[PDB]
Amino acid sequence: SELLVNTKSGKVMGTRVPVLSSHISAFLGIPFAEPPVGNMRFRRPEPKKPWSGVWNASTYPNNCQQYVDEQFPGFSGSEMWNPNREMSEDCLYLNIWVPSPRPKSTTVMVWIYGGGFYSGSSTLDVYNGKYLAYTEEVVLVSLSYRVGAFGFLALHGSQEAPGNVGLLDQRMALQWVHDNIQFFGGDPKTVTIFGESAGGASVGMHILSPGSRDLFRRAILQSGSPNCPWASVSVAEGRRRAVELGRNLNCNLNSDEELIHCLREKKPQELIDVEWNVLPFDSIFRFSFVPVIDGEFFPTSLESMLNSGNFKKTQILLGVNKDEGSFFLLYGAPGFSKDSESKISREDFMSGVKLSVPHANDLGLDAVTLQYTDWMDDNNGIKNRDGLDDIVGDHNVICPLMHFVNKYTKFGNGTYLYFFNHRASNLVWPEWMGVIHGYEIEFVFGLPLVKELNYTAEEEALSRRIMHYWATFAKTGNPNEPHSKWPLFTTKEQKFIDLNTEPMKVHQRLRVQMCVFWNQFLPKLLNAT
Numbered sequence: 001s002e003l004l005v006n007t008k009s010g011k012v013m014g015t016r017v018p019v020l021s022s023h024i025s026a027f028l029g030i031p032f033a034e035p036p037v038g039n040m041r042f043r044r045p046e047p048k049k050p051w052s053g054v055w056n057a058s059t060y061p062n063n064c065q066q067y068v069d070e071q072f073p074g075f076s077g078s079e080m081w082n083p084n085r086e087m088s089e090d091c092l093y094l095n096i097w098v099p100s101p102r103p104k105s106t107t108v109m110v111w112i113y114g115g116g117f118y119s120g121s122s123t124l125d126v127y128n129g130k131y132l133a134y135t136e137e138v139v140l141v142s143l144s145y146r147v148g149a150f151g152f153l154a155l156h157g158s159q160e161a162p163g164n165v166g167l168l169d170q171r172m173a174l175q176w177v178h179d180n181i182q183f184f185g186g187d188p189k190t191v192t193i194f195g196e197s198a199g200g201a202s203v204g205m206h207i208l209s210p211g212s213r214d215l216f217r218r219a220i221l222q223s224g225s226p227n228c229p230w231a232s233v234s235v236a237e238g239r240r241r242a243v244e245l246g247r248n249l250n251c252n253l254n255s256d257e258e259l260i261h262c263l264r265e266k267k268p269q270e271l272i273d274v275e276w277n278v279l280p281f282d283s284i285f286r287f288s289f290v291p292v293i294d295g296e297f298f299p300t301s302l303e304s305m306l307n308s309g310n311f312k313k314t315q316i317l318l319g320v321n322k323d324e325g326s327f328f329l330l331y332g333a334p335g336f337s338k339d340s341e342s343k344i345s346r347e348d349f350m351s352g353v354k355l356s357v358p359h360a361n362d363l364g365l366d367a368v369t370l371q372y373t374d375w376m377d378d379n380n381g382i383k384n385r386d387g388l389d390d391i392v393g394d395h396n397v398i399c400p401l402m403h404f405v406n407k408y409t410k411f412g413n414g415t416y417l418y419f420f421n422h423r424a425s426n427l428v429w430p431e432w433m434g435v436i437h438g439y440e441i442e443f444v445f446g447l448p449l450v451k452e453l454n455y456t457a458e459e460e461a462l463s464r465r466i467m468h469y470w471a472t473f474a475k476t477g478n479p480n481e482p483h484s485k486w487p488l489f490t491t492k493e494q495k496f497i498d499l500n501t502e503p504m505k506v507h508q509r510l511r512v513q514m515c516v517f518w519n520q521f522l523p524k525l526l527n528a529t
């Protein structure tokens, strides 16, 4: 049958799904590691152990233990991100979507999900790979990896909970794709890892990590960069936060040995219940458990790796959305709310700014205020709302990614840059938030093609237009077809394109203005004071 496949780990039998008018085959929930339950908790993952008999690949697997977002219960705008399958410490699986009939050796795309390192699932509807697979004849795989403390708790010296382990889960699935994707018709010479926010930062990170480089060809990064200030911590800090976790559960903090034995004793939900207390800062866009700069995963510091080409040289496509800040401010900042327009007082702006740049002293603080204030109208509520959206955007996504780009392209082998600024016509969040973080994904995964979710005509155009760009680049190293064109990004000129339902424009020097602020000036200033 098309649906029975022999793989180095065992025979797997999938299932066949409908898509638009045609069909496709789906393999759902293939395990690729020993379940990290028990007291494999926090440990590095181990390989699956071949099964006998025929693994059932026809339902979605579980989601990993994660914080579940209740802030707007019943609101789809927020629910669309929540685990939608049962949660379990047993959740290392992956999913494949293969064209019918099976290709022999075609392009592979591996999706890695975002979620701030504390959350996310392979199984959410917006990450359904059947449209992409179908429309572009590519093999589409989505992996899944451990989040929050289960995934990133890090007690350096120790082998019991070493750090970066979720990051290892990702690599382990990338191994299994490497070794078996050929039996599904995928060309392993030709995998593209691609992801959003934490997912983007992780792709970035496997460009850098030496044990990750050989496992893939090309990378696409959305709204995320391995150098984003919220994406890594020092080993000391990770140590500090793990022991802090131990405290709100009343563990013995005498050896590492005992901390871990303790944390391992606790039910998954009690770790989740207190995870947000270990933050060092009142802040937004910061997360508890996070890649740590351990020296084994990352041989050295991010910055100096970037500096001396110590990273995989291939070609990359990446980008930012127009309002990366809003979603964060809505959740975290005094003054913003889902149902009003959220005019912010000159009072609330100040505390907004404070929460966004939690490591700055106040001289640093003034420098920011100065930079983003309309001094001729320093009271307009709207201007403050927006100014704040740009601070959180720039400081957290746009400018660290621009820095990553500039260093990448000295030694890279081709670089393509987008600025997605389209607001979906049926977006269910309010207007003031604009083109929000995360909201290109549904265009990438091709949901505007499905009539009953209500998109414009042109939106569907934009979606396939994007999907092709993506699939072509994965297959080619170039988003463009042999004969108007998405230009390469160069250090000399720095062209990038708009992605949106009208005819594309090339521009230059994305937020260059403000990125020199965050990239050169502020850091020098905090270093002096």
Ligand SMILES: *[C@@H]1O[C@H](CO)[C@@H](O)[C@H](O)[C@H]1NC(C)=O
Pocket: 056, 057, 058, 059
């Ligand atoms: C097990 O296999 C059969 C069809 O092959 C079916 O009842 C069901 O979809 C599968 N159950 C799972 C994976 O839970």
Ligand SMILES: *[C@H]1O[C@H](CO)[C@@H](O)[C@H](O)[C@H]1NC(C)=O
Pocket: 412, 413, 414, 415
């Ligand atoms: C990178 O790729 C090839 C193959 O090694 C080389 O000749 C090419 O011109 C390079 N291009 C860029 C975009 O740096």
Ligand SMILES: CN1C=CC=C/C1=C/NO
Pocket: 081, 113, 114, 115, 116, 119, 120, 197, 327, 436, 437, 438, 439
């Ligand atoms: C969880 N989430 C909420 C808003 C926007 C993006 C997003 C990505 N999660 O992985």
